[PDB]
Design a protein around this ligand. Structure first.
Ligand SMILES: *[C@@H]1O[C@H](CO)[C@@H](O[C@@H]2O[C@H](CO)[C@@H](O)[C@H](O)[C@H]2NC(C)=O)[C@H](O)[C@H]1NC(C)=O
Ligand SMILES: *[C@@H]1O[C@H](CO)[C@@H](O[C@@H]2O[C@H](CO)[C@@H](O)[C@H](O)[C@H]2NC(C)=O)[C@H](O)[C@H]1NC(C)=O
Ligand SMILES: *[C@@H]1O[C@H](CO)[C@@H](O[C@@H]2O[C@H](CO)[C@@H](O)[C@H](O)[C@H]2NC(C)=O)[C@H](O)[C@H]1NC(C)=O
Ligand SMILES: *[C@@H]1O[C@H](CO)[C@@H](O)[C@H](O)[C@H]1NC(C)=O
Ligand SMILES: *[C@@H]1O[C@H](CO)[C@@H](O)[C@H](O)[C@H]1NC(C)=O
Ligand SMILES: *[C@@H]1O[C@H](CO)[C@@H](O)[C@H](O)[C@H]1NC(C)=O
Ligand SMILES: *[C@@H]1O[C@H](CO)[C@@H](O)[C@H](O)[C@H]1NC(C)=O
Ligand SMILES: *[C@@H]1O[C@H](CO)[C@@H](O)[C@H](O)[C@H]1NC(C)=O
Lengths: 198, 148, 49, 83, 50
């Protein structure tokens, strides 16, 4: 409406600073995601051998069968949260369809409200998570302090046990029990994510 | 005049609300800077990626317009080499574990070194300890242990 | 966009990597502390004498 | 102002209008021929301008937000389709 | 039209103020998550209940 626009022009620059605040929020969200996930400089990958001292990381390492290289637990977490599509893939094309059931997103888009897509897609977040997991498994804490230095996983867990104040012979004489307890804990994480919805 | 008063009052309240939100953000940043001054400068920090990237050694404060600048002095390992490792050493039916460091091998002889720098030493009863026998630890190798 | 250079560390169950030298690095971290202090008079802003 | 399309809404015979959540008319009954017409707003969206600095170049790129690449008119020959 | 403009402007300003407060809370949570990624995943932490 041209008359409403000509009357709204007399109210100053409320709209411009409103848009500036929303733009600052939109940039801040991408900055938050980048400063959380993009913490590693190189994309590490797991070697094709899958033995790590008896510890089983099959549920957190990515599965190459799916088009989105996500793990099993990541797929469970993505399936549990009922995220709306938020008008990403051409919302005006979908709102032009002759359907009697009108959506709320179509009313939001027709009344001037738009949702912008994030800078990092979910595949890139999964790649960053995979690189962090590969570096943590195959190098320990060295990859966060320079170049990644390889070490067997049993020796790394002995270093962690020495860090918490336990002698490494406790690990080396109880390695299979600790591996079985870790695998049972991962299976309990599976069952609690598949069962509990809260 | 009532119309102009209402408009200018709304503009002033908008400015005050934006200033309050920015004051909350600046207070959070100043609390982080105070924590970094107390931990990076007044001591040595073991927190990873707090007080710079790498193993933290020192920190220096510098003043700046509306802020502070920390010069973080850190230690970075440079030139890595491959060695053959083992969890323990089997000797006389006894399993020897290192006190501090790691067993390494350069192909023929086995030494004990520290983890963050390559300084090999002769494996001795002073720098190792004995716990159990040789049929429990997976990956144990055979070597003699020197006795002074 | 590119997330980074692809790397593959040579992991095995009897190989370790140990550094033989070092570097001393000095980095810079900049933090705001305070901002500009402002004061507003309503009677002169809204009305002006 | 808008686009009028044929409808399959089940209007009762005493109903002449259809309203939205934001209290605007979605469907109308034509007075001469008793037909139901859906009303939709015409195509629109945001325009963003991607540029380097003006001390570098005066070349720009235009991003039309949330609309497909086949509906934007009614270098610059390099049309690309993002999300 | 002036009455409708004033009402809709007030509603829009209320929405953007609530969005700014929620963005500040989300930024605080993201700072906590980045600190936990730096200190839990990239190293070993001695802090109790961290
Ligand atoms: C590591 O854990 C995975 C679980 O994610 C194991 O894979 C499953 O094994 C059971 C048998 O107990 C099968 O019924 C499932 O179909 C398997 N799931 C797969 C292959 O995705 C895997 O066997 C474990 N690795 C070991 C024990 O070496
Ligand atoms: C592994 O390191 C030992 C360190 O003692 C090497 O032993 C010495 O090697 C030098 C030559 O580099 C000889 O001159 C010495 O006589 C050796 N000392 C002995 C045998 O007590 C050993 O050669 C190294 N092995 C490899 C494959 O490099
Ligand atoms: C460790 O690295 C330093 C450099 O950071 C090396 O020092 C250099 O050595 C060469 C050859 O002796 C000199 O030409 C350079 O001027 C030195 N750089 C300096 C002093 O900054 C050092 O040799 C390395 N040590 C080992 C054992 O590799
Ligand atoms: C160690 O061995 C691996 C595989 O044999 C090789 O890729 C690497 O360059 C070697 N050196 C270092 C310093 O890792
Ligand atoms: C170590 O020596 C014992 C006997 O002294 C022998 O039984 C064992 O096989 C040896 N270990 C290896 C790895 O050769
Ligand atoms: C150690 O690694 C080798 C080759 O990578 C493999 O053949 C062997 O089975 C591994 N050891 C164990 C106990 O799995
Ligand atoms: C008005 O138009 C409708 C449809 O065009 C027609 O059926 C009706 O007879 C018309 N009425 C008159 C009075 O002409
Ligand atoms: C929107 O674009 C996609 C790919 O660019 C195309 O497949 C689709 O047909 C388009 N929709 C139209 C033209 O309505």
């Amino acid at each position: 409406s041209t008359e409403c626009s000509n009357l709204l022009l007399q109210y100053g620059s409320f709209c411009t600073q409103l848009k500036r605040a929303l733009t600052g929020i939109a940039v801040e969200q991408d900055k938050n995601t980048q400063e959380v996930f993009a913490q590693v400089k190189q994309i590490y990958k797991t070697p094709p051998i899958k033995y790590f001292g008896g510890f089983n990381f099959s549920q957190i390492l990515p599965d190459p069968s799916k088009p989105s290289k996500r793990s099993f637990i990541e797929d469970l977490l993505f399936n549990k949260v009922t995220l709306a599509d938020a008008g990403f893939i051409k919302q005006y094309g979908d709102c032009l369809g002759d359907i009697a059931a009108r959506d709320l997103i179509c009313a939001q888009k027709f009344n001037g409200l738009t949702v912008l897509p994030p800078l990092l897609t979910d595949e890139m977040i999964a790649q960053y998570t995979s690189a962090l997991l590969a570096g943590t498994i195959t190098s320990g804490w060295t990859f966060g302090a320079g170049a990644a230095l390889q070490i067997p996983f049993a020796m790394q867990m002995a270093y962690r046990f020495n860090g918490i104040g336990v002698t490494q012979n406790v690990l080396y004489e109880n390695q299979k029990l600790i591996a079985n307890q870790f695998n049972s804990a991962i299976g309990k994480i599976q069952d609690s994510l598949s069962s509990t919805a809260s | 005049i009532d119309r102009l008063i209402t408009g200018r009052l709304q503009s002033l309240q908008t400015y005050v609300t934006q200033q309050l939100i920015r004051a909350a953000e600046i207070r959070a940043s100043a609390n982080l800077a105070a924590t970094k001054m107390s931990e990076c400068v007044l001591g040595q920090s073991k927190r990873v990626d707090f007080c710079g990237k790498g193993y933290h050694l020192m920190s220096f404060p510098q003043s700046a317009p509306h802020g502070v600048v920390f010069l973080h002095v850190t230690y970075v390992p440079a030139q890595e080499k491959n060695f053959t490792t083992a969890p323990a050493i089997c000797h006389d039916g006894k399993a020897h574990f290192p006190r501090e460091g790691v067993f390494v091998s350069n192909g023929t002889h086995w030494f004990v070194t520290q983890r963050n720098f390559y300084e090999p030493q002769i494996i001795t009863t002073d720098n190792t300890f004995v716990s159990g026998n040789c049929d429990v630890v997976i990956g144990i190798v055979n070597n003699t242990v020197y006795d002074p | 966009m590119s997330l980074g250079a692809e790397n593959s560390v040579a992991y095995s169950n009897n190989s370790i990597a140990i550094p033989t030298n070092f570097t001393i690095s000095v980095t810079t971290e900049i933090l705001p502390v305070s901002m500009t202090k402002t004061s507003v008079d309503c009677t002169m802003y809204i009305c002006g004498d | 102002t808008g686009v009028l399309t044929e409808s399959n809404k089940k209007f009762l015979p005493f109903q002449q209008f259809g309203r939205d959540i934001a209290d605007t008319t979605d469907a109308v009954r034509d007075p001469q021929t008793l037909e139901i017409l859906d009303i939709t707003p015409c195509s629109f969206g945001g325009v963003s301008v991607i540029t380097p600095g003006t001390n570098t170049s005066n070349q720009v790129a235009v991003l039309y937000q949330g609309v497909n690449c086949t509906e934007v008119p009614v270098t610059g020959s390099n049309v690309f389709q993002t999300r």
